[PDB]
Enzyme design. Structure first.
Site, PDB file in Angstrom:
ATOM      1  CD  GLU A  12      36.673  27.899  43.368  1.00  0.00           C
ATOM      2  OE1 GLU A  12      37.307  27.757  42.288  1.00  0.00           O
ATOM      3  OE2 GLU A  12      36.921  27.233  44.398  1.00  0.00           O
ATOM      4  N   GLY A  13      36.371  31.050  39.903  1.00  0.00           N
ATOM      5  CA  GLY A  13      37.261  31.027  38.745  1.00  0.00           C
ATOM      6  C   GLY A  13      38.585  30.321  38.987  1.00  0.00           C
ATOM      7  CE1 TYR A  15      45.356  33.049  37.516  1.00  0.00           C
ATOM      8  CE2 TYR A  15      43.313  33.762  36.450  1.00  0.00           C
ATOM      9  CZ  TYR A  15      44.636  33.360  36.366  1.00  0.00           C
ATOM     10  OH  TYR A  15      45.250  33.261  35.134  1.00  0.00           O
ATOM     11  CB  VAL A  17      35.737  32.037  45.659  1.00  0.00           C
ATOM     12  CG1 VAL A  17      36.174  32.816  46.903  1.00  0.00           C
ATOM     13  CG2 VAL A  17      34.237  31.916  45.517  1.00  0.00           C
ATOM     14  CB  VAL A  18      34.394  36.020  41.528  1.00  0.00           C
ATOM     15  CG1 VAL A  18      34.268  37.537  41.285  1.00  0.00           C
ATOM     16  CG2 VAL A  18      35.594  35.457  40.765  1.00  0.00           C
ATOM     17  CE  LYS A  33      39.580  37.237  39.081  1.00  0.00           C
ATOM     18  NZ  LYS A  33      39.139  36.196  38.009  1.00  0.00           N
ATOM     19  CG  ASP A 121      41.708  30.571  31.153  1.00  0.00           C
ATOM     20  OD1 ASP A 121      41.135  29.764  30.361  1.00  0.00           O
ATOM     21  OD2 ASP A 121      41.416  30.636  32.384  1.00  0.00           O
ATOM     22  CG  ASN A 126      37.690  34.512  31.450  1.00  0.00           C
ATOM     23  OD1 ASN A 126      38.771  34.059  31.101  1.00  0.00           O
ATOM     24  ND2 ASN A 126      37.158  34.265  32.660  1.00  0.00           N
ATOM     25  CG  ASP A 139      39.819  37.112  35.487  1.00  0.00           C
ATOM     26  OD1 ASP A 139      39.650  38.298  35.887  1.00  0.00           O
ATOM     27  OD2 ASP A 139      39.281  36.120  36.083  1.00  0.00           O
TER      28      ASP A 139
END
Ligand SMILES: NS(=O)(=O)c1ccc(-c2ccc(/C=C3\SC(=O)NC3=O)o2)cc1
Length: 290
Positions: A12-13, A15, A17-18, A33, A121, A126, A139
């Site tokens: 869960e990033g 932006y 949930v992946v 995503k 970020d 990442n 990202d």
């Protein structure tokens, strides 16, 4: 999203949930995503990122805007650098592989930055690796595309650990130098197997930078004392030697680290200049264990 079957939640990033997903038709495996947020501006900027292609950037394959929902379909890779660094906590990542990973990441950054796109970020989470010895930035562009946050959808303490000092001092209009800073921090971490600046809040983050690199002043960073969140009342610590900070690293590596961790974002080495640094005279492409 019904053209996709969910296999597993990869995390869960920032932006949302992946999921690792299978395209229910092609058979293709992807990272799906769902964006947790419809604004037209973001759709256009996201659509621009789909044309960024480089072997060191995780490909944005599809942008699906449906039922007023946003799904982003990304190239799927099997591991990130965090888990890889945990797995090899006891031996160390061999330096030639550290170097290879650093060189390719800087190539990703040179490309993105030549397009005026920044990550903002970066973190080990990442950075994605395969069995061929490739490493890719995930990202890129999303920060500016969507807007930048506090605590995540996981209600999670996000990562200030890799945050550049100009962001921490309230600069609104920071540059590509912020990514080099973060990569600098991740380089150190690969070498020593410990986070370089593990802050538990924003001022602790800034103070951990100050305690190692010295409190910045007008000499090392013109304009520092008139940045938004700068306080004359900051303690005044002395700079430490880099031979103490990333202790086993050779002089080429530490000299490069030092250019990546310049306070003044205009003194800080570009990703393109870093690619010509003497540390990389002998770079190779080893393959990881995995
Ligand atoms: N924790 S892990 O090493 O098993 C792992 C982590 C991430 C991924 C992965 C593959 C593709 C993606 C896509 C991402 S990662 C991110 O932060 N944003 C994305 O879209 O994430 C695969 C394995």
């Amino acid at each position: 999203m019904e053209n996709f079957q969910k296999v597993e939640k990869i995390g869960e990033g920032t932006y949302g949930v992946v999921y690792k997903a299978r395209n229910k038709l092609t058979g293709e495996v992807v990272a799906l995503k769902k964006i947790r947020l419809v604004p037209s501006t973001a759709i256009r900027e996201i659509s621009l990122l789909k044309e960024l292609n480089h072997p060191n950037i995780v490909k944005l394959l599809d942008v699906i805007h449906t039922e007023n929902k946003l799904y982003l379909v990304f190239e799927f890779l099997h591991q990130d650098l965090k888990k890889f660094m945990d797995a090899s906590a006891l031996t160390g990542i061999p330096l030639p592989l550290i170097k290879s990973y650093l060189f390719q990441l800087l190539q990703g950054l040179a490309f993105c930055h030549s397009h005026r796109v920044l990550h903002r970020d970066l973190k080990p989470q990442n950075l994605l690796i395969n069995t061929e010895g490739a490493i890719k930035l995930a990202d890129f562009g999303l920060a500016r595309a969507f807007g930048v946050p506090v605590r995540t959808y996981t209600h999670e303490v996000v990562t200030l650990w890799y945050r550049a000092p100009e962001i921490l001092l309230g600069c609104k209009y920071y540059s590509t130098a912020v990514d080099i800073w973060s990569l600098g921090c991740i380089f150190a971490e690969m070498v020593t197997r410990r986070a370089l600046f593990p802050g538990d809040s924003e001022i602790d983050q800034l103070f951990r930078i100050f305690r190692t690199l010295g409190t910045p002043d007008e000499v090392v960073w013109p304009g520092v004392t008139s940045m938004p969140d700068y306080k004359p009342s900051f303690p005044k610590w002395a700079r430490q030697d880099f031979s103490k900070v990333v202790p086993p690293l050779d002089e080429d590596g530490r000299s490069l680290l030092s250019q990546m961790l310049h306070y003044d974002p205009n003194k800080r080495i570009s990703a393109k200049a870093a690619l010509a640094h003497p540390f990389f005279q002998d770079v190779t492409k080893p393959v990881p264990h995995l």
